[PDB]
Amino acid sequence: KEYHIDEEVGFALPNPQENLPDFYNDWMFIAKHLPDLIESGQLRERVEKLNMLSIDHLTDHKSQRLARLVLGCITMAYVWGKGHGDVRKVLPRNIAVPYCQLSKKLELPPILVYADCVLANWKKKDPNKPLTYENMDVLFSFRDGDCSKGFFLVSLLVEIAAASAIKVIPTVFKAMQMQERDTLLKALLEIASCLEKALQVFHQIHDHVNPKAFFSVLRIYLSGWKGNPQLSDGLVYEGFWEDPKEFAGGSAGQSSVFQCFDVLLGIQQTAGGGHAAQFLQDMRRYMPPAHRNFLCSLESNPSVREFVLSKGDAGLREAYDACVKALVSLRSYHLQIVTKYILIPASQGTDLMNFLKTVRSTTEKSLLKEG
Amino acid sequence: SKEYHIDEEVGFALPNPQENLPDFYNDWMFIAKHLPDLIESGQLRERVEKLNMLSIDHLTDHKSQRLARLVLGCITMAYVWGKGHGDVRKVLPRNIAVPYCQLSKKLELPPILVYADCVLANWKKKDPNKPLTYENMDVLFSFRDGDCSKGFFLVSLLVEIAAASAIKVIPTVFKAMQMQERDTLLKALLEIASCLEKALQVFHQIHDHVNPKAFFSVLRIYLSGWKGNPQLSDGLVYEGFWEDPKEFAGGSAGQSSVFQCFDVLLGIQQTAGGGHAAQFLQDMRRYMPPAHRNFLCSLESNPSVREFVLSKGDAGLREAYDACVKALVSLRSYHLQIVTKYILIPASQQGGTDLMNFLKTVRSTTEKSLLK
Ligand code: HEM
Ligand code: HEM
Ligand SMILES: Nc1ccc(Cl)cc1-c1cn[nH]n1
Ligand SMILES: Nc1ccc(Cl)cc1-c1cn[nH]n1
Ligand SMILES: Nc1ccc(Cl)cc1-c1cn[nH]n1
Ligand SMILES: Nc1ccc(Cl)cc1-c1cn[nH]n1
């Protein structure tokens, strides 16, 4: 179904647009040269000299997504500046207005989001070679040596690997309805295979992302203004709203591949009123609309977990457990990554580690056997 | 409409709910059916505390699990709030806390009284051979004598039913857009506007059967929850189920999918943005039966009726669309007048000006969707 889920790249926007119309060259210059303009203290001056351009000449969807990315990166650069506390609390009206206009048109909040800086922020080097890190580049970066190419592209390659399991999801629910046991068993093993491949793709992050680079540079420009003391009241989108609005910074929780497998397998991540559930439910507000619809429509289907629990079928239970264990392997490896890239650099705060352990614990206790 | 538990006659209301539980649950039912006297005489909390822990497994069909949730939910409200004078109980006894919490998880609902409980599953006909009018209806449970719970619960129900007759027209709208049937779509939109206009007239009856001071001082107290409530800043302890207390919001008509589905269908992005109103309405979807929030999800997964109408240069289609938007504005404007009379004026005779601004942002979002 057309939930904007390509069968090759999944939730990624397939072959994103690299260039806006010439009408938007003033946007594209500031975005193309964010590291240079920030380095010379010229960025904020160039943003404030902008005319208010109409979003009307952004016709197709892909050009609209590129413009959201361009404006999202400029906004983060304008707000955070050089990244050392010199912050602006008011977004100039000539960029705040078209940004908020395009954001509402695409049902996304006016802040840089995972679907912007990952799913719409890549290109093939050679269009006839496959989707490998060596054949890929990002379209925009914040500062030189911020390892944004490593962080964005590795996340994208993990997402693409997991995406090949999504084309199998309708086979699951059809087989449950048709009571096709062998079909369902094959589908589950195939999903666990793709999730286990995504873990191997995840290993690449040590080669392309440096802990100091991420923690002190890249993490700053991805921060938001919701519960942030630096902007305690939010950001004023001058010309579009009178009062400052709070919005959360980017997070892979805004990726719908990384929530749908919990939904598919009956792992109740968003159930209840806890903080982990509320966070994962909130980050859904930051996904493209087609991605929100894919999640809640999965929750409308009969439970895969209930079906397998009722069949007395060891093969079926082992295949279901294979998928759940792959999620556990992913989130356990993820806690290793967070230790290396946030915990040990902040030693030279742990609500974070409690949240990640809560989400993993919920996944592990969904296992049918083990223990 | 799919198996989203849509009755075509009463909509999202539960068709003729069950009145009596298995005799295995007479201890629950005697308490719930006698809350007015048990509370006023001061027997209630003691009787709740001396209850035996009953099991849930003897509640088979959906209609009975729902009747039990309504039973335990009212008992919970009565125990927590007592005589409604500020004496609050912050621990729910395990013998009632854990059957409630179990049955709540089985129904994918939070363990607190909800709109689907005290409205959609809290009614009966007097004469089964007569229509669904107020005179021929009654509720199954109340809190206190003179709390006006019959008028409040039933008028809300009759409005939902009047609006729900438009739901059977929703499939016609999306098929008309897909088949490119301009005349069918225009007829369907006008029909939807008709049901919302009729629902506003049903709304008028609220003044006949609900009294301001009785609602503000009595009924509103028992419907209150424990989420951001200073009287239970940390929530309620469901003894023997969760070690820690849990916060859960009070009952609200925003917990009915009928009252949010027309914003969805028309493209009023009420849950969009980060404001208080958008966050409240999205959170209240977790307090809906799963079939109801599946239905809302299904509507959101359809092509935009608003984008379709805007792209056709058809003044007839735009005016039919605007008629549906106007009816929602009318309902919410009349609703603001109700809140003034039933909350604001009584409260000034014992701040909550954020309350009117909250409702006004929702009405304003509706007005801003008019095409011309
Ligand atoms: C330098 C590397 C990374 C760091 C420092 C990091 C940091 C974090 C943190 C702190 C959280 C907790 C929620 C929050 O506060 O935002 C989180 C959650 C999450 N992260 Fe990352 N992350 C990294 C890499 C990745 C990658 C590459 C992916 C996927 C390709 C990923 C997937 C997720 C997901 C899905 C969540 C939501 C929790 C869950 O579903 O388990 N992380 N991450
Ligand atoms: C004495 C009568 C009433 C009072 C005092 C009242 C009060 C309120 C209040 C205070 C809110 C704000 C949300 C909250 O704080 O919970 C609200 C919202 C709402 N009310 Fe009621 N209400 C009354 C009757 C009704 C009835 C009969 C309906 C039947 C449909 C209704 C439908 C709604 C809806 C749908 C909302 C959500 C906001 C929106 O969608 O615009 N109200 N009401
Ligand atoms: N991989 C990511 C890519 C982009 C953005 Cl904005 C966030 C993340 C992320 C991963 N884990 N937490 N956030
Ligand atoms: N929750 C996830 C679901 C799917 C995939 Cl492929 C990865 C993750 C993940 C990665 N890091 N933390 N969680
Ligand atoms: N009509 C209602 C019926 C029942 C309950 Cl629990 C709440 C409401 C309501 C009205 N306005 N906001 N909520
Ligand atoms: N949002 C609504 C949607 C449908 C109907 Cl029938 C009524 C309302 C309503 C009533 N009062 N406030 N909102």
UniProtKB/Swiss-Prot annotation, chain A:
Places the protein is found: Cytoplasm, Cytosol
Domain of life: Eukaryota
Predominant location category: cytoplasm
Tissue specificity of this protein: Expressed in mature dendritic cells located in lymphoid organs (including lymph nodes, spleen, tonsils, Peyers's patches, the gut lamina propria, and the thymic medulla), in some epithelial cells of the female genital tract, as well as in endothelial cells of term placenta and in lung parenchyma. Weakly or not expressed in most normal tissues, but mostly inducible in most tissues. Expressed in more than 50% of tumors, either by tumoral, stromal, or endothelial cells (expression in tumor is associated with a worse clinical outcome). Not overexpressed in tumor-draining lymph nodes.
Pathways involved: Amino-acid degradation; L-tryptophan degradation via kynurenine pathway; L-kynurenine from L-tryptophan: step 1/2
Keywords tagged on the record: Cytoplasm, Dioxygenase, Heme, Immunity, Iron, Metal-binding, Oxidoreductase, Tryptophan catabolism
GO biological process, one term: quinolinate biosynthetic process
Pfam name, any one: IDO
SUPFAM superfamilies associated with the record: Indolic compounds 2,3-dioxygenase-like (SSF140959)
Cofactor binding mode and count: Binds 1 heme group per subunit. In the active form, the heme iron is in its ferrous state Fe(+2). The catalytic cycle does not alter the oxidation state of the heme, but IDO1 is prone to autoxidation.
Activity regulation, free text: Activity is inhibited by and MTH-trp (methylthiohydantoin-DL-tryptophan), modestly inhibited by L-1MT (1-methyl-L-tryptophan) but not D-1MT (1-methyl-D-tryptophan).
Catalysed reaction equations from the record: D-tryptophan + O2 = N-formyl-D-kynurenine; L-tryptophan + O2 = N-formyl-L-kynurenine
Enzyme Commission number(s) of this protein: 1.13.11.52
GO molecular function, one term: tryptophan 2,3-dioxygenase activity
UniProt binding sites for heme b: H334
Induction, per UniProt: By IFNG/IFN-gamma in most cells. Exogenous inflammatory stimuli induce the expression of IDO1 in antigen-presenting cells such as dendritic cells, macrophages and B-cells.
Assembly with partners or alone: Monomer.
Function: Catalyzes the first and rate limiting step of the catabolism of the essential amino acid tryptophan along the kynurenine pathway. Involved in the peripheral immune tolerance, contributing to maintain homeostasis by preventing autoimmunity or immunopathology that would result from uncontrolled and overreacting immune responses. Tryptophan shortage inhibits T lymphocytes division and accumulation of tryptophan catabolites induces T-cell apoptosis and differentiation of regulatory T-cells. Acts as a suppressor of anti-tumor immunity.
Miscellaneous: IDO1 is the target for therapy in a range of clinical settings, including cancer, chronic infections, autoimmune and allergic syndromes, and transplantation.
Family: Belongs to the indoleamine 2,3-dioxygenase family.
UniProt cross-references to PANTHER family, sorted A to Z: INDOLEAMINE 2,3-DIOXYGENASE, INDOLEAMINE 2,3-DIOXYGENASE 1
The protein's name: Indoleamine 2,3-dioxygenase 1
